[PDB]
Structure formats: structure tokens, C-alpha cells
């Protein structure tokens, strides 16, 4: 039973439930996610919490992250997930399209001190954009 | 457009699984080359078997969502997204019970005001990944 | 060194070179690919040879199949390949677009009696279609 | 003739040739690309030139960006492109694999004062990652 994978599964559940009160349990104080850089300078558990909140706000409370597979190698975990949502909040300067979508994701996670220290994820941006009807942005984010 | 209306009825038939009225919009000589592996049937009967297979393989809850539909003369292009769960044998791959969703592009040719030729391109590789990349147990 | 994997690499090399003199070495007499049922009733090394020729005709002599990875499990091989080409011949009723494209592919091959007996391949149809400029078919026929 | 589309085509040409001496002609002094934030805090023509350099360093001098289609709506341009390269440089902590790859991209560009002022680019991250043999990162750094 991998502690690393169990922690990643808690992370996934956070996206599903939206509940982030306990994230300090598995999110390192120095947690970073380069994908968040455009939105905030926060780090650690508060950074992960703001990501989860953004997901529920933008892609609906009913947004789901489904697990396809999770593997590990030393202090690293690779998660193959699928995001299901509906576009209901402003997304980087694109007005809500109200469109359903689903997009595969690959996540790379690095563990330090038994907690998630670095988190990179690659949404299916283009696939999502297509399913959103390829909206034209209304403003720069 | 009556053509776009017909394609929307086709999409609904996948969603409801109800194929009693398909002769309304499916040409007697309807062909879908993607079906050749499974059957030699044509027309409304062929379309119905395709719909039945989707419900059997991808669950009763399988549905097609519309992204967009375009037309040009006697042709329609439908940009759709299939949502389902792999519950039935899929060309020799055993049921995985896994959820999946994959964009699709459908090209439809109308003759005599009905759908005469139908090509569709599922996201085979994306679906395969979401199904955990199963190894086939047999040749279809 | 897997003989099955070696056979699949010979298959890939045939698409690359267009050289098919020796395909009977590794293609089963009863070889079938369900994806080409629309085009011909051929089977065996004969079917494979014409499929290779069609690729070179439709996607140019310079069309390439690059290997990402190949794995095997008992009598089955899974090949992760990438096709590169330029669309220069009629393709299912769509006129040549002259467009460069590249698309990942997943191939599933079943061996029987030491030769490739069943071959299923999944091109990135939609990705390819996008890169071709999403052409409208001119005919539902071959033309 | 669209001056905007012409400008975006000069941008595309810069990725292809690696020739960036004239980028100030079409890149706004305040040009930003949020995709670059992990790597640099630069803005303007300098940021664009750095991006081009990184592409050539990481994906080889032979890297090419092919045009599928470009459209515009008011002060916005959408470019549908395809990147071709070979993974020859360290890529966010993943060692060079020497592997060929090609992946579609969608770019969204906003013009201000007749120059490219904001640039968002969605590579096919997952498809590229696959073609690179899904490498495990050697560092987070
Ligand atoms: C706080 C800032 C963020 O939370 C936004 C950022 O998280 C974000 C995410 C979160 C994520 O990585 O997957 C759950 C996803 C997307 C995005 C995102 O900013 C996107 O911006 C995005 C897009 O512009 C076009 C298509 C798809 C997407 C996304 O899928
Ligand atoms: C200054 C540094 C940057 O320029 C890096 C950034 O360019 C970057 C680019 C540039 C790009 O937009 O293509 C024309 C592409 C990728 C990436 C990138 O940082 C990637 O990081 C990347 C990846 O991690 C996995 C798969 C693909 C990619 C990229 O395709
Ligand atoms: C009647 C039986 C059929 O025609 C099977 C066939 O419908 C079929 C469909 C339905 C369709 O859209 O083609 C018209 C979809 C898939 C498939 C299919 O046979 C697949 O076989 C399939 C697969 O093997 C791996 C991933 C995805 C798929 C499919 O999405
Ligand atoms: C004899 C005629 C043929 O066999 C056509 C057939 O070869 C074919 C191949 C080759 C192959 O993968 O078969 C084993 C590839 C494609 C296709 C094909 O017929 C396609 O039709 C096709 C398409 O309509 C839209 C996008 C992509 C493709 C293909 O990539």
C-alpha cells in the first residue's frame, strides 16, 4: 500500500468534493504548481486549495476527476485522470459557454517529506476548447 | 434545415435507444462502413443494430452530446461527444466497467432527403486509454 | 529478442520503404484488417501489400511510420506508432488536400502460427482530419 | 489582407527560422504569455525571443511550426498550428529523449496598438509526452 498514491487519491477526492480543510495533511508547505502562476503567488496548502476552488467555480460544483491509473517511481507519482465538467465560470478571459466537456489529464507529482511538493498537470486544453465550441476570449486575463 | 433536423433525430436515437421510427430519416440503402466488421445489413435495420450495439457495449446510459453541426449541399458534418461506460464486449476486449468520453466527427450524405451514407470517427485512442488499454482476449 | 516484435517491425518497415516482396514471411495467409473492409475483400499478404501501396499513394512515398514503443502479451502485440505524410491522393471521397499531417496510432496485432493473423489499427482520424483542413467529401464513392 | 494575420504569420516564421532580430516590429512592448511564467519574468519582444530560443534549444534547430489555419475576430487572432520537433534539450526536468514528435497547437493572440499584446498557446502536452515515451522527470528543478 503506497502512502504516496494514497495521498494522490486524497488530492483527487478534494477536486471531487471541493473540501480542502485537511489539505495540509498531504500538501507540502512549499507546494508549487507552475500552472497556477498566472492566477496567484500563493504556495503550499493554500495554493492547492485555491486550485480546487477555481475548478468548482469554473467547471461547476459537479465537476468530477475520474481515475484511470496511478503509478509511482521513487519519490514521483504519475496520475492519469479525466476531468468532467460544465463551463460555468470565466476561464482566462473567456465568458462561460455553459458547455459540457470531458478531458483526459496527466499529472506529475514530486514528494518531499512524504507530502506533495511539486505538481504539474496537463489538461487536454485543445480537446476541452473544442467541446466548449471554441470560444473567442472577451478580455485578457 | 431538414438535413440538420434529421441528424438531430439520429443523435436522439442513440440517446433513447428508440429505433422504431428510424425509417423516417434513414435511407433504405443506408450504409456505414464502420459496421462492416459486424454485419451485412443495410438501411434502417443497419442503423438500429448500430444503436443497439452502443447501448449493449457502452451501457443504456451512453449518450451523444452535440458540439456543432454544419452542412454543405447534401452533406452534414456533426461534431459530437460520446459518453459511456464499457459494460459489453468491445471487438474482443472484455468489459472493463470503466467510464469514458470521446469526441466524434460524423460525415453524413443525404439522398432522397434521407441519410444514405454515414461515416463516423470515434476517438479510438482516447477511449482506449480511458478503458485502461485492455489487451484483447480474442479476435473479433 | 521477441520474434513477434521483430515481425511487427518488419511490418512497420514495409510501410516506410514501400518494399513488400517478402510480406508472406510474416503476414498470415488469413490476415485480416477490419479497417480496410470498405475498400477490398482481399486477405493475407495480398491485402497487406495493397494496404501498403495505398498508404504510399495516398500519403506520399515519403510517408513515415515512426515507432514510439511496442509491447507484447502472449500472442498479442500492441504497437504505438506515429504516421507522418502529405495528403496527396483521394481518401474516402475527399479530394487531395496537399496537407502535411502527423497522427499517433495504436495497433493491435494477433499472431497465429507465428504470423500476423489479425490487425486492428486506430489512426488519429479526427486529429488528421483537422490537419487536413477538415475537407468536405466530394463523393460517397471511391470517386 | 489582414495586418493582424500577417503579424501572427511573422511570429510563426520566427519559430521556424529562429531569426528574431526584428520581433519588435510585431511584438508589443508589454507582450505577455502566461505559459512562460515558470521560466522567466520577462515581458515584450524580449520574452517572445526567449520563447523562440527555448523551442530551438529544447526541440532542435530543425523544429517547425506548420500552419493549419488562422482566423480573426476584431482585435483577436486564433492560430491553429502544428509543432514538429525532436526532444534534444531538458524539458521541465525531463532529460532529452532524442525522440521525434509532432503535436497540434492552438494559439490565441490579442492585439493592442497593432502589435501582439497577449499570447496564450496550448501545445498538445499529453500527445507530445506519449511520443517522448512518457519520461519520468529526473528533477523538479
Ligand atoms: C487557480 C487557477 C487554476 O485553478 C486554473 C487552472 O487550474 C486550470 C485548470 C485546472 C487543472 O489543472 O485541471 C483541473 C484547467 C484548465 C485551465 C486552467 O486554467 C484552463 O485555463 C483551460 C483552458 O484555458 C482551456 C481549456 C482547458 C483548460 C483547463 O482544463
Ligand atoms: C521560455 C520557455 C518556454 O518557451 C517554454 C515553452 O515554450 C514550452 C513550449 C513552447 C511552445 O509553446 O511550442 C511552440 C512547448 C512545450 C512546453 C514548454 O514549456 C512543455 O513544457 C511541454 C511539456 O512539458 C510536455 C509536452 C509538451 C510541451 C511543450 O510542447
Ligand atoms: C454494430 C457494431 C458497431 O458498428 C460497432 C461500432 O459501432 C463501434 C463504435 C460505434 C460507432 O460509432 O461506429 C459506427 C464505436 C467504437 C467501436 C465500435 O466498434 C470500437 O470498436 C471502439 C474500440 O474498439 C476502441 C475504442 C473505441 C471504440 C468505439 O468508440
Ligand atoms: C485500401 C485502402 C485503405 O486501406 C485505406 C486505409 O489504409 C486507411 C489508412 C491506413 C491504415 O491505417 O489502414 C491499415 C489510414 C487512414 C485512412 C484509411 O482509409 C483514412 O481513411 C483516414 C481518414 O478518412 C481520415 C483521417 C485519417 C485516415 C487515415 O489515417
Q: How far apart, in Å, are the Cα atoms of D61 and each of A78, C86, D19, D53, D131? A: 30, 22, 11, 9, 19
CA of C29, closest CA in chain D: separation in Å?
A: 33
The count of CB pairs under 8 A between chains C and D is: 31
Burial (Cβ within 10 Å: 0-12, 13-18, ≥19) of residue B2: exposed
**Distance (Å, rounded) from C-alpha B62 to C-alpha C88?**
37
Cell match 468520453: residue?
B101
Domains identified in chain D, total number: 1
Which region, left, alpha or beta, applies to residue A134 given φ > 0 means left and ψ of -120 to 50 means alpha? left
Q: Do C106 and B124 touch (CB under 8 A)?
A: yes
Q: Which residue has the cell 519574468?
A: D41
Q: How many whole angstroms separate alpha carbon C38 and alpha carbon C131?
A: 23
What 3-state class would DSSP assign to B73?
A: coil
C-alpha cell at B84: 459511456
The H or E element that residue B109 is part of is strand B99-111
User: How many angstroms separate the alpha carbon of residue A51 from the centre of ligand 1?
Assistant: 9
- CA distances for C13 relative to B140, C16, C70, C125, angstroms: 26, 5, 14, 22
> Do B139 and C129 count as a contact with CB atoms less than 8 A apart?
no
Shortest-distance ligand to the CA of residue B128: 3
Alpha helices in chain B (DSSP H): 2-16, 43-58, 124-130
C-beta atoms surrounding B112 within 10 Å: 8
Nearest CA in chain D to C128: D104
Shortest Cα–Cα distance, D36 to chain A (Å): 9
D64-73/B114-122 β-pairing? unpaired
**Interface residue B77 vs chain A (CB under 8 A):** no
The Cα–Cα gap between C64 and C103 comes to 11
Q: Does C129 touch chain D (CB under 8 A)?
A: no
Exposure of B88 by Cβ count < 10 A (0-12 exposed, 13-18 middle, 19+ buried)? middle
| Ligand showing the shortest atom-to-Cα distance for residue C12 | 4
Contacts of A102 in chain B (CB under 8 A): 81, 83, 101
Experimental approach was: X-ray
Burial D104-134 (b: 16+ CB within 10 A, else e): bbbbbbbbeeebbbbbbbbbbbbbbbbbbeb
We report the CATH number of the domain holding residue A128 as 3.10.450.50
CA of C105 to the centre of ligand 4 (A): 11
Triad D106, C135, C100: Cα angle to 5°: 60
E-strand stretches of C26-125: 27-32, 64-73, 76-86, 100-112, 115-123
| Contact (CB, 8 A) for C80 and C92 | no
**Pocket lined around ligand 3, Cβ cut-off 6 Å:** B 32, 34-35, 38, 49-50, 53-54, 90-91, 120, 122, 124, 127-128
Of D68, D102, D133, the CB nearest to C133: D68
At A54, give phi and psi (nearest 5°).
-60, -40
Q: How far is CA C142 from CA B108, C89, C92, C93, in A?
A: 16, 11, 6, 6
- Grid cell digits, residue C64: 513515415
Of the candidates B13, C72, B67, D33, the one whose C-alpha atom is nearest the C-alpha of residue A99 is: B67
CB atoms within 10 A of CB A62: 11
Closest residue in A to B128 (Cα) is A68
Integer Cα distance of A103 and B81 in angstroms: 11
Name the residue range of residue B21's domain.
Answer: 1-140
**What stretches of A3-132 show up as alpha helix (H) in DSSP?**
3-17, 44-59, 125-131
Chain-centre distance for alpha carbon C66:
12
Chain D residues touching A125 at Cβ < 8 A: 106, 122, 125
Does residue B4 sit in helix, strand or coil? helix
Q: Say yes or no: A66 contacts chain B, CB-CB below 8 A.
A: yes
Alpha carbon distances (Å) from A39 to A95, A97, D26: 17, 21, 26
Say what the resolution is, in angstroms: 1.9
Residue of D88, D126, D48, C1 lying closest to A79 (CA atoms): D126
Distance CA C97, CA D141 (A): 44
Q: Is D9 helix (H, G, I), strand (E, B) or coil?
A: helix
Q: Which three cell numbers stand for residue C100?
A: 502535411
Amino acid at each position: 500500500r503506497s502512502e504516496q498514491i494514497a495521498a494522490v487519491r486524497r488530492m483527487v477526492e478534494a477536486y471531487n468534493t471541493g473540501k480542502t480543510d485537511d489539505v495540509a495533511d498531504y500538501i507540502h508547505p512549499e507546494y508549487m504548481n507552475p500552472g497556477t502562476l498566472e492566477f496567484t503567488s500563493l504556495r503550499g496548502p493554500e495554493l492547492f486549495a485555491i486550485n480546487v476552488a477555481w475548478v468548482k467555480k469554473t467547471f461547476s460544483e459537479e465537476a468530477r476527476l475520474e481515475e484511470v491509473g496511478i503509478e509511482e517511481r521513487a519519490d514521483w507519482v504519475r496520475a492519469r485522470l479525466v476531468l468532467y465538467g460544465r463551463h460555468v465560470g470565466e476561464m482566462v478571459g473567456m465568458a462561460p459557454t455553459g458547455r459540457l466537456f470531458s478531458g483526459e489529464q496527466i499529472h506529475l507529482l514530486h514528494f518531499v517529506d512524504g507530502k506533495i511538493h511539486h505538481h504539474r498537470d496537463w489538461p487536454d486544453y485543445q480537446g476541452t476548447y473544442r467541446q466548449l465550441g471554441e470560444p473567442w476570449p472577451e478580455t485578457e486575463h
